[PDB]
């Protein structure tokens, strides 16, 4: 039995470029987490309590996604490499602008998974594509959800009254079509 | 065993300036109570039923705070001195103006506690600082809450529709971020 | 009513050096979180499943501590400033060495709170000392707990059999004296 | 409507090389079953009752995996071909050596699924890749589990005391990190 780079028994070696791509994607998930924390704070500073609660939960979920990836590297007997985390964006001119950043970040998270997926396919790593499949499935739902939240906020067209209504929807957990 | 000024057995004497400051602070809490009653009435006169209910409860809470302080003087074997209570403010041009007075009054209540606290520290009265610690803790929460209510009302920007939505939030007990 | 730096109504201004110290302490808590994640992974790579579960939970708790601090700045109408997060340490020669780093990090977290506390006292910021008091209380318990875990691991004196027993204790949630 | 080779109505023909690969993989699963039975017996002969119970259950699970594959061939209207089953290995010098064989066999089972998967992809058989996807997912978990059991046994470093502790873990059903 061979030992993998993290010391555990190795079921099958992983291409180093794919390993690096997974480690970098973990940073993407961690950065989405701190970005959603920053967005939570921006909303709290404006008394948008439902948006604050939504993004507070979204931050914890993105962190869970990151940890899920660290567990996969453990399962593959690969080393993790937790990286320096950039500071998040913290300023937005409006809720609509914030929601646009949130949507783009979910789409960018999917793009990063897609890049890892294509690398795994080039390397015939079927464990990794199988691992990523349900994560892409969840990304479709998250993109649908954030397109819903962004589109509903844009429909409000900057009216505080409409934004309060939507804020209360989010506080109640009404966060997708769905 | 020595007897304190209110006749009970005395665990430790209290500096007269600190006693006077506590008695005056009890008046501050009593004045916040009647001010919140006046604010309740102003809201009721304008059919802002959720704001009326909120301030009706806030008036009773401030009275409870005052009584809590009277119990501490009893516990320290000090005399209470219930003072003349000024008439509250009763007129405001708008809900936003009323909420600004409410926020300033909570901040002013904390300032009065802070002044009592500094006096107790100058006199090395650790019973009094320990007594006040949870009250300052509650003031942080109350300031956070009234900053939330004021900020949300200002966000409404005087729109009756938005104010009705917020009014219904308060009637439902949705009164902080939180 | 004055507006604080984050835009909310301001109950009382905060000294900029104290604000900076709180923002930096939030980074300390966030760094403890990612450090405990790294420690969780190190334990998982060595099949120390109880230690892995313990540090996985500790990482989430430290993140909760950080968020608790961000909420206080919101409550004080102060701006948050989420900072770049350094990469954690990820290599240890033994479980005893890892537990020593964990203990030192808890002690260093308390030292950072103590530094914030002394600054608040110099500035007569009683809201901040009251806010920090229960956090120091929790630090005493955490230091007691990590001294217990470290001391028990050192008692094992590197024997794998004893470390498996302790590992199972942690998996069962037996993590303090207590 | 065309009839498939096993006589049922045929939704889509299957490449004969892919069929042969699936039939051979069923033998791999059946061989893992009898190997785990042999390992169960080896453990029982040494009073390692928790390991015996674990491998007794693992033998039944591998048989279930084999039957799952026979059902897929039925569903595809393909003939099964249950093959001669080799005798399992039955002798090991130590528990660590046995656990190494167990881990290698799980990795080899995944390799066999991977070979079937690549053949299905060459033949654009999306039914078969979809069928195999959750099976690879389960293999990741099984490899993680057997790397955990092997690594924990190796950590014991041949100490009977540590092996008794681990044996009791397995009897209690504590068989992964997890
Ligand atoms: Cl907007
Ligand atoms: Cl108004
Ligand atoms: Cl050790
Ligand atoms: Cl052994
Ligand atoms: Fe994510
Ligand atoms: Fe996401
Ligand atoms: Fe009060
Ligand atoms: Fe008050
Ligand atoms: Fe902490
Ligand atoms: Fe800590
Ligand atoms: Fe199997
Ligand atoms: Fe298997
Ligand atoms: Fe799938």
XYZ file of C-alpha atoms in Angstrom, chain B residues 16-136:
121
model
C -23.455 60.838 49.748
C -22.622 62.168 46.272
C -22.996 58.671 44.830
C -26.301 58.243 46.670
C -27.570 61.532 45.238
C -26.490 60.461 41.749
C -28.411 57.183 42.059
C -31.528 58.957 43.303
C -31.306 61.390 40.396
C -30.835 58.539 37.935
C -34.044 56.930 39.217
C -35.759 60.158 38.130
C -34.176 59.773 34.675
C -35.681 56.296 34.341
C -39.057 57.533 35.583
C -38.890 60.394 33.091
C -38.087 57.983 30.255
C -41.194 56.043 31.294
C -43.560 59.010 31.085
C -41.847 60.135 27.865
C -42.534 56.748 26.280
C -46.136 56.999 27.514
C -46.411 60.396 25.796
C -44.892 58.889 22.656
C -47.372 56.001 22.829
C -50.225 58.517 22.910
C -48.836 60.546 19.996
C -48.668 57.350 17.936
C -52.180 56.288 18.990
C -53.549 59.697 17.949
C -52.230 58.988 14.431
C -53.494 55.357 14.228
C -49.902 54.064 14.383
C -51.087 51.139 16.460
C -47.864 49.119 16.351
C -45.780 52.073 17.484
C -48.386 52.778 20.160
C -48.139 49.210 21.462
C -44.332 49.314 21.359
C -44.074 52.537 23.369
C -46.802 51.439 25.778
C -44.620 48.454 26.643
C -41.449 50.554 26.695
C -43.036 52.864 29.279
C -43.700 49.926 31.593
C -40.159 48.613 31.090
C -38.566 51.946 32.021
C -40.689 52.031 35.160
C -39.396 48.528 35.959
C -35.845 49.841 35.523
C -36.569 52.629 38.006
C -37.960 50.200 40.574
C -34.894 47.964 40.091
C -32.768 50.927 41.181
C -34.974 51.599 44.220
C -34.429 47.977 45.283
C -30.659 48.432 45.110
C -30.782 51.417 47.467
C -32.909 49.292 49.820
C -30.316 46.502 49.566
C -27.555 48.992 50.419
C -29.572 50.303 53.414
C -29.781 53.734 51.757
C -32.794 56.019 51.681
C -34.737 56.469 48.487
C -35.870 59.974 47.543
C -38.590 59.853 44.889
C -38.506 63.258 43.215
C -40.868 65.563 41.376
C -41.271 64.317 37.799
C -41.279 66.849 34.969
C -43.992 66.744 32.338
C -42.845 64.873 29.212
C -42.514 66.305 25.755
C -45.785 65.637 23.962
C -45.533 67.180 20.481
C -43.554 66.054 17.431
C -43.768 67.094 13.787
C -43.264 63.548 12.456
C -42.642 59.962 13.446
C -38.985 60.395 12.453
C -38.636 63.316 14.860
C -40.285 61.294 17.629
C -37.967 58.335 17.024
C -34.969 60.680 17.165
C -36.080 61.911 20.594
C -36.540 58.283 21.684
C -33.031 57.337 20.556
C -31.465 60.383 22.195
C -33.278 59.575 25.420
C -31.874 56.033 25.488
C -28.389 57.408 24.851
C -28.934 59.993 27.604
C -30.057 57.239 29.982
C -26.792 55.420 29.322
C -24.829 58.641 29.870
C -26.498 59.014 33.264
C -25.593 55.418 34.211
C -22.046 56.086 32.989
C -21.843 59.134 35.275
C -23.004 57.052 38.247
C -20.482 54.363 37.268
C -17.547 56.789 37.194
C -18.541 58.125 40.619
C -18.713 54.603 42.052
C -15.245 53.911 40.660
C -13.850 57.115 42.193
C -15.282 55.893 45.511
C -14.155 52.254 45.022
C -17.778 51.114 45.366
C -17.526 47.747 43.640
C -21.055 46.753 44.655
C -22.378 49.643 42.585
C -20.242 48.998 39.499
C -21.240 45.307 39.614
C -24.878 46.353 39.990
C -24.613 48.710 36.994
C -22.677 46.360 34.674
C -25.735 44.368 33.416
C -27.689 47.615 33.130
C -25.083 49.041 30.757
